[PDB]
Amino acid sequence: GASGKLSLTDMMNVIDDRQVIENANLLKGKSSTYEVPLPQRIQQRHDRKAAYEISRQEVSKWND
Amino acid sequence: GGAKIHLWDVNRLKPVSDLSWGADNITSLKFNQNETDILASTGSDNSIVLYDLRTNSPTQKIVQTMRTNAICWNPMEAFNFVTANEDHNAYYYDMRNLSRSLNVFKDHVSAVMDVDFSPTGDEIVTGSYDKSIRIYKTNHGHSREIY
Amino acid sequence: KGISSSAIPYSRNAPAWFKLSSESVIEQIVKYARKGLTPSQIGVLLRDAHGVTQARVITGNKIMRILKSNGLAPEIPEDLYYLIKKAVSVRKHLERNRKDKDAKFRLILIESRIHRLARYYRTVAVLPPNWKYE
Amino acid sequence: KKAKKDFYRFQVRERKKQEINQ
Amino acid sequence: SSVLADALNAINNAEKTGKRQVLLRPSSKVIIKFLQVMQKHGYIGEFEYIDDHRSGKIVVQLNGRLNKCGVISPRFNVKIGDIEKWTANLLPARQFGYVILTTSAGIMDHEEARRKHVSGKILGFVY
Amino acid sequence: LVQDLLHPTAASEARKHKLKTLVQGPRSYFLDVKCPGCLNITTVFSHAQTAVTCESCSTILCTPTGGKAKLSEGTSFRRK
Amino acid sequence: GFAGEEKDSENYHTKVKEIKSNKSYDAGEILASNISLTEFGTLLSPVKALLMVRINLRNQNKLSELLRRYLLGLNHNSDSESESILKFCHQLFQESEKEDFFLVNLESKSYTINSNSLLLNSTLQKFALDLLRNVITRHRSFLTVSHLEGFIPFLRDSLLSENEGVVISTLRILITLIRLDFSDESSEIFKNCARKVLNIIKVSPSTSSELCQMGLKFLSAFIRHTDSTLKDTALSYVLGRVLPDLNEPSRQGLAFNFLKALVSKHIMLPELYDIADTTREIMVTNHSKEIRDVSRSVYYQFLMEYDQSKGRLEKQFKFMVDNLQYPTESGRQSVMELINLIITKPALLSKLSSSFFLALVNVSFNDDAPRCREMASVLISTMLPKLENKDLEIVEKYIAADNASFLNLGLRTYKVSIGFEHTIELDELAIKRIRYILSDTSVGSEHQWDLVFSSYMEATESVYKHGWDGIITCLLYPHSWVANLVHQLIANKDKLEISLTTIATRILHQLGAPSIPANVSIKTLVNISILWKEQTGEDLKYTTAIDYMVTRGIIRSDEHRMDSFMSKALLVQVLDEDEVIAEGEYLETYYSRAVDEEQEELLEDKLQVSDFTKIYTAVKQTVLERRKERRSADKKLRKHARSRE
Amino acid sequence: AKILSQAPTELELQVAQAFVELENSSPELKAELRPLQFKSIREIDVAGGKKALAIFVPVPSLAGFHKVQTKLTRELEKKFQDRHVIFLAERRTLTAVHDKILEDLVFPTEIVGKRVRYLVGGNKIQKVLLDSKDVQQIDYKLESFQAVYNKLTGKQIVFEIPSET
RNA sequence: UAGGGAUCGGGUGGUGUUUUUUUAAU
RNA sequence: GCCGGUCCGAUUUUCGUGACUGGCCAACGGGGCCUUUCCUUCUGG
Ligand SMILES: [Zn+2]
C-alpha cells in the first residue's frame, strides 16, 4: 500500500544484477505477450472481414 | 427481415439467430440458388448487405445512392446477383468484388420495383413502378423488349 | 421576395478550437459597450475580434440580457432607435429641399414601419407607454 | 470605431445631467 | 396557413403526380402522430423526421396506396352516434377507408374510436 | 434529377445552397492568421465584414469585401 | 385488457399510482388463495379465456412473467409440500396433451384464420411450462420415484414436442432427476434425450443461445452422473462446436460448467488443449465479474489434472509470468489468484519461485497498490513456503539487486535464517545510517522556506518498524522526525521507540515543532500527552503549556483542543494555558466550538483565570483601539466583501 | 487529493492520482488544472465488455476543461487502460439536460444530425450522427457512447457517422 | 402541370488569356 | 445460480446424501435517502 513511484523500469535490470544461473532462471521465465482486446465493433469488423475472406475463398470453388 | 434480420427454423417458435450490422431495418432478402448457406439483403440505409450462415455473421456491406428494392441471385453463376433500386436502373453485381457493378441495365423511367433471373441463367425480367415490365439479356445492358 | 440570411449551425456549444475563457468575452463586450457601440456592432466585432460564433453560444445568454445584467441596457431597442434615426435624417433632408417627393414617400413608409414596431413595443410593454413618437 | 452618442441608458443619463448642470 | 392542411396537400398532390419520396418541410407532432396512424394502417411506407432545431422536416417513402387524404378545417365536436353519419358523408363506403379523430388518447381512427369507446373532434380523413 | 430526398451525395450537398439542404448550416470557416508585423496569431471570420486589426501591431489583416474578405498580402493563414 | 393497455400506452403520464406494481399482486395473493381446490382453477381459467382468441409476443411475454410470479408464489407458499396437488400437475399434463341466396350480408371483411389452429398449441406450451415449473418447485420438498414415474411419459412427450419454453423447463427437470434412479426406462430416456441435445447442437448454428447453453449444462450432468457415457467422437464434435463461441458473450456459466465437468471427468481429447489456451487468455483478459474466476477454475483444473509436456509446461508458466504485467486491475488479480493456487498446492515451485518473487516485486513496483498488496501477500506465501534454496537466492537478489534496490531489500527484510537476516540487517543499518542523515534537516529547511527523496526515509521507517543498535537507530529516527507521510511514519516510529526502550524534552520539542509547523497527528498528540503526563519537569510542563498556547490547521487545532480538555491540585498545576480556550470561548469552527463546549463542561481559580484572560483581551482591545485612534485603512477593512463576492 | 471529499473511493482517488502524476510531469500544465473541480465519477458497464467512467464537472468549469481533454484522456488511457472516460455537466426542462449531456458526452462539440425514422410496425428509431472529425479514433468508442447515453436517460439512441461505416 | 437555354445584379470555386510588377485600389 | 467450508461414510485426493455456514452473481419487490444544493420575489392589513 506504501506506493512510492521510484521512476524505475528495472525488470530485466533487477534480473541482471547477480551471479550466474539467476539470469538463466530469468530467461526461463520470459514470454512478454497477451495484449488488451479492442472494443466490440472493431473486433466485429475485423472478424467479419475474415469471414468475407473465407467466403470469397469458398465461392472461388465455383469460379471454375 | 424486419427491424433486423432473423433466422428461424421450423422446430422453434423463437428466432435462432439475429444477424444485423446495426439497428437498421431491412427491406428485402434473398437466399441463393446454390452455395445455399450465404444470402443477401437490402435495407433502407440504401444498403446491400451479404451474410454467411456458415460463419453465422454478416460479411460485407455496400451503400449505393438510392434504396435497393429487390435483389435476386443468379441460378447458374452462384456469385452474381441483380439488384433493383429506386434509381431507374437494375445493377448487376459480382459478389467477390463488390467495388464495381459489372453491369447496369439502364432503361426505365421510374423505380425498378422487382427483378428476377430466368432459370436458364441469362435473361432478366424486371417490373417497374411505372406501369411496364421489361425483359433484358444479361450480356447487353439495354432492353431487349417491353410489355 | 428573396432570402439572404445567416445559417446558425446545428451545434450549440463553443466550437472547441476556442482557446479563450468565458468571462473574458463578457469583459470584451462590456468594454465595447462602454466605448459606446450598438449590440449588433458588438456581435460583428465579436465575430471578428476573437473567434466566437455568437454570445448565446459562447456565453450563457444573449448580449441583450448580459448587458442588462452588467447594467448597460439601452433605453430603446436597436431597430426602434435605428428607424428613428433614419426618420429624422430623411426629415432633415426633406426640410433642406422639400421638392423630393420620393423622400416624402419614403418618410411616410418609415413612419408606418416605425409606428408598427411602436405598437408592438407598447403592447408588449417593454418601453413605458405614452411613448408615441413625439 | 463607430460608437454612438445616444441609445444607451447611461449615456443619455450623462447627456441629461450635462443639460441639468449647464 | 394551416400546417396540417398544407402537409397533407403536399403528400396528396405528390401522390397524384406519382413520385415516391416526398419532402414535407413544416412539421409538427400532430402531423407526426397523424401519418403515424396512417402508416399503422399501411397507407404509406416508412418515413423520417429529420430534426433541425427550427421546424424539423418530414420525408415519406410512400408506395402507391393513397388516393386522397385531407383535413376538415372546422374541428368540431362529433358524438359517437354521429361518426357513422360522418363516415357516410366523407368516405365512399363504410369500411373502405378511415377517418381519424382527436380524442382523449388522441390520434385514433374511427375503428379504434368505437373499440376504445371514446370520441372527440374530427381533424382529418384518409382513404 | 432523381435522388433520394434523404441524405444525398456529399458532392450534391456541397453543390447546392446552404439554406436548401436538409440541415442548413454555415459555409464560412474561421481561420487563424499570423500577423506579419509581430508574429502572433489571431482568429478571423471568413466573410469578415470589417477591417480587423492585430492587437500587438494594428497594421491590417483583411480589407472587407462582399463575400470573403481579401487577406492583406503578407499574412499567412490556416483554416480551423 | 383496457387498463393494461392504458398503462403500457405512452400518452398517460401524470400520476404516481399508474406505475402499477401489477405482479406483486399475485405474488402476495396466492400466498393466501392457495386453497388449491377451486380458486387456483379460477386463476387459470380467464387466462385461457383470453388466450383462446389472439395474442402478441408483447402480451405473451408479460403473461409468461405473470405465470413466473405464480410459480415463485407457490414456492414461497407452504400449503402444498406433500403430494396432494401432484394430481393437478398430472391433470395439467392430461389437459395439455344456394343456401345463402336469401341470407343477408354486411361486414365484408372476413375472419382471419390465424386465431387458434396454432394458438391452442400456444396454450399447451405455456401451461406445460407452468406445470413443469410446478414440478421443479416441488423438487424443493421431495423427489419421490413412484409419484412421477407416472409423469415421465408426459415428460418425454413434452421434450419431443420442441416448443422452446417447454424444452427449457424439461432439461432443467432432467438435470435434477439425473441424481435419482428409475429403471431401464430411464436409461432409454436419458440416452434418448442426450441424443436429442446432441441433435439440437447439430442443428442450432450457435451455442450462445439459452437453449444450447442449458443443454450443455445437461450434457455436463449426463457426463457426471451415469454409468454409461457415450460417443467420444461426438463429444469431441460438440466441444469443437463450443470452442469458437468462447469470445462473444451470453455463453458463460453453463458452458463453463460443462467444461469444468468433463475436465474433472478426465477424458483425453486433442481439442481440450485449444480450449485451455483460449480459456487462459479469457481468464487473463476478460472484463466481466466471476467469468474470469470460473475460467481460472477450469484452467487450473486442466493445468493440474492433465498431462502436458515440457514445452507447454514452460510456455504457460512464462505466459502467467508476463500476464502479471497486464494493464488491468482485475485480470492481474485473477492471475495473482492463479499463482496463489499454484503456491498453495513442489519441484515446480522450486523452479518457479525465484522468478515469481522477482515478477511479484515488479508488480509491487507497478500501479496503484491494489495489485501491489496482493503481490506482497503472494510473495509472503512464497517466502513462507520456500524451504532453503529459494530463500537463499531471494536473499542474494535482495542484497545485490538504487532506490528501488534499497526499497526492495527493505520490503524483503520486512517480510522475511536469522543470522543471514542479521547480516542483511547490518547492511540495512549501514544504508539507514547513510540515508537518514541531514535529509530530514534539509526537509525541515524546506518547510521553513515554505512557512517563512523520502523513499529511503519511508524504507528506513519500515525497516525500523521491522527490527545498542536499537539505540543508534532510535537516535537516527529522532533525527529523521527532526514529506508529510515521512513525518507521519517517523512519529509512529518515535512513539514505538519511546514505548519500547533533557533527551525526552528534546524529543518532545521536535514532536511539538513537527505537529505545529492527520491520524498520525492524532497519535502524535496522544504520545505527547502521554509523555507530558509521564513527566526540569516543571520547566518542561511550562514549555508544553506555552507550546499549546502557540498552537491554539483544523486537525491540529482539534488535537490541541482535545489535549487541552484532557489535560485540564485541580488548578494549581493546571492554571497555565486556559487563555487559548478562553479565546476559543466553517466545519472546523463547529468542531472547535464543540470541543470548547466539552472543555467548558470539563472553581474560584477558574473564575480567576477567566477574569485574567478577559482582562488581557480587554487590554489588547484597548491597545488596538488607542493605536487606531492615534493613527487615524478603510479600504483594507471594507474590501473583504469585494473579495468574497 | 483534489476531489470533493464527501464520498471518496479507490478508483476516483486513483484518477486524482493520475491527475497529480500528470502534475508531477509538470512542464505543460502551467497551473491550468489547479481550478479542477469534480462532483462524482462513476464506472458503468457497457455491452462491449469494457467500462466507461463518467466524470462530472459542475459547469462553470466545463469551459475550464478546455484544451486539457485530449491530453488528459491520452494520459489516463495509458495510465488506467481499457476504460472509456467521458466528462459531463449536470443539474419544460430536462430534455435540455439530456441533449446537453449528449453534446458534452460525445466531445466538446461535433454532433451534426438528429434523425428519427418510424418503421411500418410502430418501432421508432432515433439516430444521432457526428460530423466527420477524428473518425479513426472515435470509431472505437461508439458503442460505449450509445450504451452510457441509454444508461443515463433510457432513450434508445444509435450513433452514426456519415461515411462508409 | 413540368423541363431547358440565354441575360442582368451579387456571391463561391476552378485555371488560361487579357492583366502586370513596392504608389493606393481590386 | 456459482463457489469455499463444519461435518457422516468411504479417502490421506474425491464422491453420495442429509443438516448447516459464509464469499458472490442476476431477477423480483419493501423501507428510506440524493436529484425542493446553502442565499433574494404573493394577491390585502
Ligand atoms: Zn504583429
Side-chain angles (χ1 to χ4, degrees), chain C residues 10-16 18-22, chain H residues 66-67 99 103-104 107-109 111-114:
Chain C
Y10 194 73
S11 158
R12 205 187 286 106
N13 51 1
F18 211 75
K19 305 294 177 174
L20 186 136
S21 66
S22 177
Chain H
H66 198 185
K67 66 170 223 203
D99 65 344
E103 202 151 334
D104 303 279
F107 197 68
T109 61
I111 58 155
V112 80
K114 286 197 198 190

Side-chain angles (χ1 to χ4, degrees), chain G residues 39 100 284:
Chain G
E39 275 179 47
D100 58 60
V284 175

Side-chain angles (χ1 to χ4, degrees), chain E residues 48-63:
Chain E
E48 198 146 331
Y49 179 85
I50 169 65
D51 166 80
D52 42 357
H53 303 302
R54 297 163 203 85
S55 166
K57 305 168 183 178
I58 282 297
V59 281
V60 179
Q61 304 172 16
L62 55 91
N63 43 17

Side-chain angles (χ1 to χ4, degrees), chain B residues 9 11-14 16 56, chain G residues 162-163 200 204-205 210-211:
Chain B
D9 47 6
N11 305 146
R12 281 91 175 91
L13 262 283
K14 292 191 53 191
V16 195
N56 206 347
Chain G
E162 294 97 11
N163 195 350
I200 74 173
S204 183
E210 52 86 12
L211 168 68

Side-chain angles (χ1 to χ4, degrees), chain E residues 41 43 65 67-68 87 91-100 109-111 125-127, chain G residues 109:
Chain E
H41 279 321
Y43 270 56
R65 293 194 36 84
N67 51 12
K68 199 195 294 284
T87 48
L91 306 195
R94 284 310 147 96
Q95 79 269 354
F96 166 70
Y98 300 97
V99 49
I100 55 184
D109 39 337
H110 78 303
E111 284 178 348
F125 81 113
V126 51
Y127 73 107
Chain G
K109 300 271 187 51

Side-chain angles (χ1 to χ4, degrees), chain E residues 33 95 104-105 111 115-116, chain G residues 2 6 11-12 108-109:
Chain E
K33 264 167 181 59
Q95 79 269 354
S104 287
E111 284 178 348
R115 178 176 103 84
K116 200 65 74 76
Chain G
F2 276 105
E6 296 265 329
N11 297 272
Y12 289 86
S108 305
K109 300 271 187 51

Side-chain angles (χ1 to χ4, degrees), chain F residues 34-41 54-59 61:
Chain F
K34 170 188 279 182
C35 178
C38 182
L39 321 170
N40 77 311
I41 317 294
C54 164
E55 272 96 330
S56 74
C57 44
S58 87
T59 64
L61 289 165

